[PDB]
Ligand SMILES: *CCC(=O)Nc1cc(C)on1
């Protein structure tokens with residue numbers, strides 16, 4: 088079996104000429120030459136977690152141009168022998184995190200990237216799925232700037248009727264992209280949580296810097312309020328939880344920072360859409376289909392070419408380890424000879 092940085096990376100004879108790419112959310116990732124399709128591919132070693140089963144089930148069900156697919160899964164032929172799982176995907180030149188660290192984006196690139204994010208998100212939301220961890224590093228790009236959403240490890244089926252929670256409830260997803268309501272009264276079980284993340288991504292494309300780089304849980308909220316300003320009476324009245332509402336009432340009045348002052352070189356239509364995605368009240372926040380129909384995206388908008396899922400998708404953290412391993416074995420069976 089082939090080895091990489093003194094660690095087993097056992098992808099069988101189909102995949103050769105490994106090159107270390109780096110570490111991702113799951114472990115070691117290499118490119119390899121796929122001797123069947125005659126192209127280099129990306130391979131991630133997984134070494135279970137409910138997140139692995141969630142990713143695999145979702146990615147195998149979805150089929151969309153702006154969502155990363157699974158090309159192949161490598162594992163031992165039996166549960167008893169199965170230790171590692173290798174997930175083979177299209178090799179992508181880069182991701183939006185790397186690109187923003189190094190490259191200024193043209194307005195045309197920002198518009199095209201945002202279109203493709205929203206086009207992919209339309210499909211995810213049409214399947215009643217929430218991604219819940221949208222951020223630049225989870226947006227892959229190829230050499231021609233085709234964009235694909237990845238990492239469904241934190242995804243959930245939407246459940247708005249069970250979204251309410253108390254103030255300061257702990258949350259898993261990446262802090263800088265969390266909607267204000269996560270810190271106040273929301274479990275992140277509604278589609279509006281993903282639109283906020285997209286808004287944060289758009290702002291980050293406009294300036295190459297994260298818009299709300301909070302250093303800890305509550306500081307994230309105070310970055311958001313530092314730009315949006317104090318919520319209105321109406322928006323406060325929507326927060327029925329007293330601890331959350333009284334926290335907000337305790338704060339000094341903060342003025343809204345105009346978007347054109349934060350992003351003086353931005354397209355005005357981009358800033359109108361940004362405003363609508365970064366709305367404090369999640370009930371007032373623009374939805375994915377409205378965002379696609381926004382004038383900023385008029386060059387691209389074509390709802391007949393923005394497909395939806397054939398059916399809604401449909402738990403994991405309630406199962407013992409032996410049960411989760413058995414389920415991963417079953418979900419990956421289709422790739423065996
Ligand atoms: C879905 C995100 C992803 O695949 N990212 C990644 C892989 C590597 C090696 O670094 N980032």
Ligand SMILES: *CCC(=O)Nc1cc(C)on1
Pocket residue numbers: 321324325326368370371
């Ligand atoms: C708290 C009341 C509220 O904001 N609800 C609401 C607003 C909109 C557009 O839809 N529901």
Ligand SMILES: CCC(=O)Nc1cc(C)on1
Pocket residue numbers: 108129155176177178179180181182227
């Ligand atoms: C599917 C994942 C992927 O292609 N990841 C890569 C590729 C390069 C370079 O950097 N990350």
